[PDB]
Amino acid sequence: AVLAVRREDVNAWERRAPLAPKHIKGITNLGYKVLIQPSNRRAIHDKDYVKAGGILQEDISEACLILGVKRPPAAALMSRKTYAFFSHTIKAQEANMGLLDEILKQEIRLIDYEKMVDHRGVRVVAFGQWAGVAGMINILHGMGLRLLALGHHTPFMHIGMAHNYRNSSQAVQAVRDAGYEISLGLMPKSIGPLTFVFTGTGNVSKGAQAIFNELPCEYVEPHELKEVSQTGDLRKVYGTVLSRHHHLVRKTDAVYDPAEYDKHPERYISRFNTDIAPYTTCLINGIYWAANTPRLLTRQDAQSLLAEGCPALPHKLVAICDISGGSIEFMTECTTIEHPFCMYDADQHIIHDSVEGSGILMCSIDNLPAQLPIEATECFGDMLYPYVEEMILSDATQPLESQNFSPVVRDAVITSNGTLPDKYKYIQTLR
Amino acid sequence: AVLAVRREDVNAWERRAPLAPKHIKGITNLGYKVLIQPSNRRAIHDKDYVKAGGILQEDISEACLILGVKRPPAAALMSRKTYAFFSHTIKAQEANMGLLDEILKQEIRLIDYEKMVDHRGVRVVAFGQWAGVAGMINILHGMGLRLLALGHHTPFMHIGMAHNYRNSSQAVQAVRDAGYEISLGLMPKSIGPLTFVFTGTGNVSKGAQAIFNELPCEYVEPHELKEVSQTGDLRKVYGTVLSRHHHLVRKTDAVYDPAEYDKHPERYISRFNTDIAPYTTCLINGIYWAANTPRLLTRQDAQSLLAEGCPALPHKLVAICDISGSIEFMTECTTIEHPFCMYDADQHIIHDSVEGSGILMCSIDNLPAQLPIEATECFGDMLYPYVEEMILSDATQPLESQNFSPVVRDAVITSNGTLPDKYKYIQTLR
Ligand SMILES: [Mg+2]
């Protein structure tokens, strides 16, 4: 019963860990030995895990359970062990198919965080609200550069990228300082009031709203967005939270039924393109798109939206940041931490790593919580902590049926004893 | 006698102004009318100039003197006026030749800030130390990214670009906070102590040292860098200021004579490549290169410099930042948008990258634009005493009848319709 936290080596920006020092202290209190593989890449220093009771050691062959965040290289895999990380093999991705064979060859039991769900189907291990926190900092930083490219200096120029701040607290202070300048009237008058639209009910939307609340903000209802976009006070920023009933209407009767939409989303359409989009400066998209869910904006909608010293904006919509996705059809490509922003012009072509031109600024980062890795690590570790003890007690050599697993851990096992279970047998047929 | 401050439209990053509101208040106190062309690009808001006494007006045809920072577009030029900006036509630059003839056609008097000098030859109007302040913030930000690409999370990751901060004070707070983490021991042990070398005696070198003083720094002599580079405390950063006598020696006897080096720099060489460079993590170059001054580093010197969970640095030298020809292998310059480039052992430069085994290099032509408010106040303070004589000038009257000081007078490039004798060579140089 020995636990090891492996070093992340997927990419340079993976500074997170599956467990935080306070979680390691709890595991050592239960009587389990925890090995910590040294890593200069992790945002939490090795000395903090030593204080919690972990042992700094390169050789983690002693451990039967190896915890990581992202996929490990094939050569690093140790045979006859239990590994837990994000495999991204659920859709039989070719890149991770070379990894999957080594796990089967080494007779490794693999638990995937993404498959861990409760009885209602909600994932029980995730990074919480921090993707929204990081997304809001980035999009405010991107709007400063985009507005400067259009010729307007704004206080948003004084907000850096999310990864430029030690933690969310230091970023909050920077947001307040830029907000102070806005309340002082340092915004350019010709661009008009700025309106922020938040979509979704998940934790990422609340995290994005938390950063927004540090600005001089006033929340208005969606139907008021038309009014505020023209007569709003320039010493404030305006925000609105989009709910289902605000924009979803039936194709037949334009009626919204909460129970019917959840069971039958194919019968509904979205009025976001005409009711909200023309009066939106910045869209923060947190909607988790499901089967037959209507899209907020289409390529046809973008064509409608895209048409001396102090010029006005060419179009009201400046930027869109998705913090959770198919909701926006013309957002076909994703950005990275290194190149956070791209432009979608009226010619329906994407200019990557640019804030210039007449297009719409777009931001779509797949690993937003990596920009706030310390706070993301504690949040992830809090969710994973209750399931850790049953994972350490697992034995990679014994069959799955003899293991004392809960349904959350059991259904998440992709590989075990060299062979894929029935529920994941389909992977082999999918290339 | 009407003065106007034109709107900057050279590039998106030109947020500076030739005069600050506090300077406009003094000019209005003298009784002169000041027009302010509205500009969303300016870092200082239009209302602050209105408070100082300026008048917000798009049409500045009433003014006889138009002050800007950088070049205006040719179409915007108003005939029979006096303009003051950086023209960059003294060396007959191809790009600005189309501007220069247009100025001659409009019969405009052009004063160039860079040509304004004192009797000793020192420029009297400049942006001061702020280029060095911005350069130090950027290079610390670049070292965090470069070290992360090498596999090391560092507190330098928590320092942004200069243009991400409202002023130098907010940047100082971030540098202090990263310094706190260094003093707490959060730096990775495997990379070892970090050594910073500052060169030059100009104002920009002093500005970069000011940001460095906010870190947990210990200053050592340049020759001590060899010892500290191995046994230095990992909770401190180490810096040294390079003087002439430390690295400059004559070829024949290895002796340094201050008076002779100034008169005959060709007789001297620099051993910085062997005595200090191998033990330098980050080089901040502020030396102003002269005719026969020896080079600090050569391409062959770079070839000599370029050769499990906690890896060591591939080579001691990580980054070089130029804040001012001293370094030949720095053949290309970077921009604010793409601040860093890598010079590899293959002698090819990969721009906008912090990855690979090369040497990270940063060389921005307009560093003060990242701190435009403080750069505007410094530039305006130097220009303010010469402003009044420019307002009294008349573009239609001959240059010889104008009451100009020698500083302003020699800086007139175009005068009335034809270039003066001192600038006659420009047309023949094309
Ligand atoms: Mg970049």
Numbering used by the authors:
A (entry chain D): 24 to 330, 340 to 356, 360 to 466
B (entry chain A): 24 to 330, 340 to 356, 361 to 466
Which sentences did the original study use to describe this structure?
Therefore, to obtain an LOR structure of a protein that maintained catalytic activity, we focused on the longer construct (amino acids 21–470). This initial construct crystallized readily but did not diffract well; therefore, we introduced five surface mutations to induce better packing. The longer construct crystallized in a new space group as a tetramer. Each monomer is very similar to the short construct with a root-mean-square deviation (RMSD) of 0.5691 Å2 between the most similar chains. According to the PISA server, the average dimer interface of the longer construct is 1810 Å2 with a predicted ΔG of −6 kcal mol−1. At a structural level, the C-terminus of the longer construct forms an alpha helix that penetrates into the active site of the adjacent monomer. One hypothesis is that the C-terminus interacts with the catalytic residues of an adjacent monomer with the enzyme active only in an oligomeric state. In the structure of the long construct, we see electron density at the interface of these loops from two different monomers that sit between Asp 388 sidechains from each monomer and Glu 373 carbonyl backbones from each monomer. We have assigned this density to a magnesium ion which could help neutralize the negative charge from the aspartates.
AASS is a bifunctional enzyme with an N-terminal lysine-2-oxoglutarate reductase (LOR) domain and a C-terminal saccharopine dehydrogenase (SDH) domain, which are homologous to Saccharomyces cerevisiae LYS1 and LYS9, respectively. The LOR domain catalyses the reductive deamination of L-lysine and 2-oxoglutarate into saccharopine (EC 1.5.1.8), which constitutes the first committed, and possibly rate-limiting, step in lysine degradation. The LOR domain itself consists of two lobes, both Rossman folds with a central beta-sheet with alpha helices on the outside. Moreover, AASS is a unique drug target for inborn errors of metabolism such as glutaric aciduria type 1 that arise from deficiencies downstream in the lysine degradation pathway.
